[PDB]
């Protein structure tokens, strides 16, 4: 069996695909899909920036979608932010 940490990493892949498999390219989260991703998966301090703001940040090749590696930017940022908050009262 995989470890809990390994399962967590594979679950991150699973999360992305809940949104990427809605339509179109299987590894594309479109601007409308990213709104649903953020609303469902990210806490309010992450969402509040705005879905269009996040989309412009994540779509590094300006091709109209967030691919898996682009999504990992959001994952990394969410992680660092959550880690910082774990040390705040």
């Amino acid at each position: 069996m995989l470890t809990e940490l390994e399962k967590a990493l594979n679950s991150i892949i699973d999360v992305y695909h809940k949104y990427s498999l809605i339509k179109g390219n299987f590894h594309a989260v479109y601007r409308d899909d990213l709104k649903k991703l953020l609303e469902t998966e990210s806490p309010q301090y992450i969402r509040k920036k705005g879905a269009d703001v996040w989309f412009k940040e994540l779509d590094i090749n300006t091709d109209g979608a967030v691919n898996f590696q682009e999504f990992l930017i959001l994952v990394i940022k969410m992680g660092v932010a959550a880690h910082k908050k774990s040390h705040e009262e």
Partner: protein
């Protein structure tokens, strides 16, 4: 309250902390702590690499961006991203389509 993604991140942070706290600075991983985390919690994803202690040392050196011989959470999370990437890549290794399917990922299933 917590989403799936949030729980996954929580797992990552919790696993970091359960080793960082052991020795020395409590919010960084020293070499021993990192080696233990990799040996235990990445036993499948890094199964080949775990056979070679010097490979594990290089991985730590690469991640240690400020070159202080400690991994901060910020430095460590790049390993998580890389392994998540690697597992997804393994799921698509040799993919001929049609459309979207995942094979088993890193370390099996």
């Amino acid at each position: 309250k917590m989403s799936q993604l949030e729980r996954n991140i929580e797992t990552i942070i919790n696993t970091f902390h359960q080793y960082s706290v052991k020795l020395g600075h409590p919010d960084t991983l020293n070499q021993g702590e990192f080696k233990e985390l990799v040996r235990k919690d990445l036993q499948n994803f890094l199964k080949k690499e775990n056979k070679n202690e010097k490979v594990i040392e290089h991985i730590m050196e690469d991640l240690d961006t400020n070159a202080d011989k400690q991994l901060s959470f910020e430095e460590f999370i790049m390993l998580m991203a890389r392994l998540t990437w690697a597992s997804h890549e393994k799921m698509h290794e040799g993919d001929e389509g049609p459309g979207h399917h995942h094979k088993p990922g890193l370390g099996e299933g």
